[PDB]
Enzyme design. Structure first.
Site, short mmCIF file in Angstrom:
data_model
loop_
_atom_site.label_atom_id
_atom_site.label_comp_id
_atom_site.label_asym_id
_atom_site.label_seq_id
_atom_site.Cartn_x
_atom_site.Cartn_y
_atom_site.Cartn_z
N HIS A 99 41.51 45.18 44.55
CA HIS A 99 40.49 46.12 45.04
C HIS A 99 38.99 45.83 44.75
O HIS A 99 38.08 46.64 45.22
CB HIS A 99 40.95 47.55 44.73
CG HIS A 99 40.39 47.82 43.37
ND1 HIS A 99 41.30 47.96 42.22
CD2 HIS A 99 39.17 48.06 42.97
CE1 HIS A 99 40.47 48.29 41.16
NE2 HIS A 99 39.16 48.29 41.56
N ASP B 125 47.70 45.54 42.79
CA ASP B 125 46.21 45.32 42.80
C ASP B 125 46.01 43.96 42.11
O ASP B 125 45.82 43.88 40.87
CB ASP B 125 45.69 46.42 41.96
CG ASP B 125 44.15 46.52 42.12
OD1 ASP B 125 43.80 45.79 43.11
OD2 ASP B 125 43.49 47.28 41.36
N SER C 218 36.91 46.63 36.20
CA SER C 218 37.96 46.34 37.08
C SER C 218 38.11 44.91 37.28
O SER C 218 37.02 44.24 37.51
CB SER C 218 37.59 46.97 38.39
OG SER C 218 38.96 47.25 38.93
#
Lengths: 252, 9, 4, 27
Positions: A43, A99, A199
């Protein structure tokens, strides 16, 4: 990172920054797994509801960093992506299941004091360390507070793995087999979390058998940053390993 | 608050 | 969900 | 190959300030 510490020099030599070509800007963390491959969360590249869909060139990888923002003249290395590989069944539609993505650098980087790859787990290493209570370590140059800021140096925190059921009971989201959560319990009286900008970063463990560092997870998602009763969610790197081998002796 | 990347890149 |  | 051995720590036998916290957690 929320409630971290400043990393020490060379503590995470596999940490990598995903850097926005223009506006020049910090996109996410990533990790170096070889002299040509980087692992991150699918993502940070493709996120359709936010209109995000980066290409090999709106993009730049920065390795051996300590400073979030300074050009670290004879320490960091910058590379260009030759290609991006997103998990074919990554589920941006409902929960970021799978992910994960691989980035193949245009040319290999050379190892040094500040740059060295992290190991990818074996089915037995995974087996013994992925247990509720064991701590792992997350690093990133993201948000220091849920909402205010951005640190001056690489931040670090050690968090314990939490059992699946508590993980599932903390949210309304549907948790899959390719995810694991982590953090302390409101009653443990210690805290900290990954936050925005972290992230694609790595959740690592030190193997007590061989004294080597293993990448067990990738920071994926959360609900707020460091709130009581919430946890961070991470891609389970060992469950996605067949997919990793495959893209590597395919286009590597 | 980003410092400047060398143009070669 | 808050993609981080 | 020599993955996960840090030039500035494992390779010279220096421990970072908090790895022991992780190692103590492996029960």
């Amino acid at each position: 990172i929320v409630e971290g510490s400043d990393a020490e020099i060379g503590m995470s030599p596999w940490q990598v920054m995903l850097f926005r070509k223009s506006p020049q800007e910090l996109l996410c963390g990533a990790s170096l797994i070889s002299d040509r491959w980087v692992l991150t969360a699918a993502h940070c590249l493709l996120y359709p509801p936010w209109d995000k869909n980066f290409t090999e060139n709106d993009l730049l990888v920065r390795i051996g960093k300590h400073s979030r923002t300074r050009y670290e003249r004879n320490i960091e290395k910058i590379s260009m992506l030759e290609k991006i590989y997103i998990h074919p069944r990554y589920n941006w539609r409902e929960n970021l299941d799978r992910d994960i993505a691989l980035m193949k650098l245009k040319k290999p980087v050379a190892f040094s004091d500040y740059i060295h790859p992290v190991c990818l787990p074996d089915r037995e290493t995974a087996a013994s360390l992925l247990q509720a209570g064991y701590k792992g370590r997350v690093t990133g140059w993201g948000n220091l507070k849920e909402t205010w800021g951005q640190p001056s140096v690489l931040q670090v925190v050690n968090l314990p793995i939490v059992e699946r059921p508590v993980c599932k009971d903390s949210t309304r989201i549907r948790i899959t087999d390719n995810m694991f959560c982590a953090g302390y319990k409101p009653d443990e009286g210690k805290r900290g979390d990954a936050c925005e900008g972290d992230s694609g970063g790595p959740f690592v463990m030190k193997s007590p058998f061989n004294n080597r560092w293993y990448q067990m997870g990738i920071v994926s998602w959360g609900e707020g940053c460091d709130r009581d009763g919430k946890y961070g969610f991470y891609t389970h790197v060992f469950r996605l390993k067949k997919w990793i081998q495959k893209v590597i002796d395919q286009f590597g | 608050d980003f410092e400047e990347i060398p143009e070669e890149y | 969900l808050d993609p981080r | 190959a020599d993955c996960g051995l840090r030039p500035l720590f494992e390779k010279k036998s220096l421990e970072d300030k908090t790895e022991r916290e992780l190692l103590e957690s492996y029960i």
